[PDB]
Amino acid sequence: DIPIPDEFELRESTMPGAGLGIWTKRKIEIGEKFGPYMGEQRSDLKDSSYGWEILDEFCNVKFCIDASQPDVGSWLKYIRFAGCYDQHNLVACQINDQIFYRVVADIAPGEELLLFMKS
Numbered sequence: 001d002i003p004i005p006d007e008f009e010l011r012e013s014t015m016p017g018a019g020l021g022i023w024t025k026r027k028i029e030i031g032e033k034f035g036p037y038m039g040e041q042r043s044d045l046k047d048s049s050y051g052w053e054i055l056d057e058f059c060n061v062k063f064c065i066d067a068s069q070p071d072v073g074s075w076l077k078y079i080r081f082a083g084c085y086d087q088h089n090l091v092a093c094q095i096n097d098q099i100f101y102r103v104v105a106d107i108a109p110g111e112e113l114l115l116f117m118k119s
Helices: none
Strands: 010-013 021-025 040-042 051-055 061-066 090-095 098-103
Touching: 051 090, 051 098
Parallel strands: none
Antiparallel strands: 010 021, 040 061, 051 061, 090 098
16 A cells, blocks of 8 residues: 555545545644655646646646556645635645645644645
């Protein structure tokens, strides 16, 4: 399987219909980063699925990182997306052509890790 760190728990997300999410047992402070997001390098994400675009100088796609398939990826693939404004505690950022998730609000023990809502 895809291993989940001991400091996190994989269990039912509070996002309706999202399935299993990632929950912390430790306090997580603003400014911590997680990753890199892992997966197969692809030209695009036709199946939106689980994945991120990596961008060049000009904000155009250099390539994409796709974790569609169940055996590929890291525990970050299970972090779900907030549904509301300021419901999230993570944002993606890009460093050396890899995606990391940056903590933007404090996460107390027993709370779900949630990315910035989709458009």
